[PDB]
Design a protein around this ligand. Structure first.
Ligand SMILES: CCCCCCCCCCCCO[C@H]1O[C@H](CO)[C@@H](O[C@H]2O[C@H](CO)[C@@H](O)[C@H](O)[C@H]2O)[C@H](O)[C@H]1O
Ligand SMILES: CCCCCCCCCCCCO[C@H]1O[C@H](CO)[C@@H](O[C@H]2O[C@H](CO)[C@@H](O)[C@H](O)[C@H]2O)[C@H](O)[C@H]1O
Ligand code: SF4
Ligand code: SF4
Lengths: 65, 81, 138
């Protein structure tokens, strides 16, 4: 806590169910390393019975900001 | 394609996730870093029929497979007999 | 057959399994271990018993002969084992090969998962017109 970790993020890929909608996050990755970090989470479910997916900062367009 | 339905996802972890599907899917082939580190989308698929039992469980987050193979043996449908 | 009678997996009759197309083409068969004399469920509708030998029942087609597991592992046992019989020999060594239990690591074998480009924006439709000179035979 000091910058911004997981406090409000849209999705922008167009495949991902809650795509353009902004729900909440969690333990976003630490290290330099990989390509699929970030958990996100929101109320609304989706086509599977369980939906709580991990997208990745190449993107999260949050966008402003 | 001749069995080409994409169930891929991103975790490709397979614990309380997915196993079901007659023979086809001998995976756990850990790619150099993807969390529970077992990955990809299949093994040698020239063996069994056309499920989508394939997802039904454990994410594909996009599509999920079904029939799309067309070129379709028989061993690839129960009935060659 | 009889003059050679080599059995293992008890049954009696049945209009279920094996018929003409398991000579004229391929064969498929499952084998297993077991503790003490136990009555099972069966593919093809019927139902019999066990004890041993090879415990080597032969089966019509291989989706049929792994379902000994989809229940025949809700009835104890590490070991169950199905191969591929021809009308003459091998290539396709079915539960043979390397390790076993689909969910471990020795090698990687096939699979891949990607095509050219990955799941990403294939709003991009079908590209080139199919023409004998640009890597779309995979
Ligand atoms: C708390 C009091 C008990 C003392 C233990 C200390 C607790 C902290 C250590 C926990 C990790 C120990 O290792 C432990 O990993 C798994 C459960 O976690 C079990 O293993 C299991 O889970 C693996 C993932 O790890 C799976 O791939 C396997 O299918 C399965 O065999 C191990 O059989 C167990 O030994
Ligand atoms: C690269 C992974 C698969 C393809 C894109 C991945 C998903 C989208 C993110 C990629 C964003 C980068 O886009 C990328 O476009 C081209 C592919 O290298 C590069 O384009 C460049 O490629 C080389 C250096 O880079 C040069 O020899 C080329 O003259 C130049 O056009 C861009 O410099 C790069 O920015
Ligand atoms: S998404 Fe399906 S099978 Fe794919 S990696 Fe996970 S469970 Fe494995
Ligand atoms: S989904 Fe396809 S490959 Fe998977 S088990 Fe079913 S048929 Fe086989």
């Amino acid at each position: 806590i000091g910058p911004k970790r997981g406090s409000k993020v849209k999705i922008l890929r167009r495949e991902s169910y809650w795509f353009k909608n902004v729900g909440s996050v969690v333990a976003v990755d630490q290290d330099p390393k990989t390509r699929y970090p970030v958990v996100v989470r929101f109320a609304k479910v989706n086509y599977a019975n369980i939906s709580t997916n991990n997208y990745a900062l190449d993107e999260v367009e949050e966008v402003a900001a | 394609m001749s069995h080409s339905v994409k169930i891929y996802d991103t975790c490709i972890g397979c614990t309380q996730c997915v196993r079901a599907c007659p023979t086809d899917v001998l995976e756990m082939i850990p790619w150099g870093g993807c969390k529970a580190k077992q990955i990809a989308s299949a093994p040698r698929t020239e063996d069994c029929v056309g499920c989508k039992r394939c997802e039904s469980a454990c994410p594909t987050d996009f599509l999920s497979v079904r029939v799309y193979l067309w070129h379709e043996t028989t061993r690839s449908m129960g009935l060659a007999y | 057959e009889l003059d050679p009678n080599t059995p293992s997996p008890i049954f009696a009759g049945s209009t279920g399994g094996l018929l003409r197309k398991a000579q004229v083409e391929e064969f498929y068969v499952i084998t297993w271990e077991s503790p003490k004399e136990q009555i099972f469920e069966m593919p093809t509708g019927g139902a019999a018993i066990m004890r041993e030998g090879p415990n080597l029942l032969k089966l019509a087609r291989k989706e049929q002969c792994l379902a000994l597991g989809t229940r025949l592992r809700s009835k104890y046992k590490i070991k169950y084992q199905f191969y591929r019989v021809f009308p003459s020999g091998e290539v396709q060594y079915l539960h043979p090969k390397d390790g076993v239990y689909p969910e471990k690591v020795n090698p990687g074998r096939q699979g891949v998962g990607l095509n050219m480009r990955s799941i990403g924006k294939n709003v991009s439709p079908i590209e080139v017109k199919f023409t004998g000179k640009q890597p779309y035979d995979l």
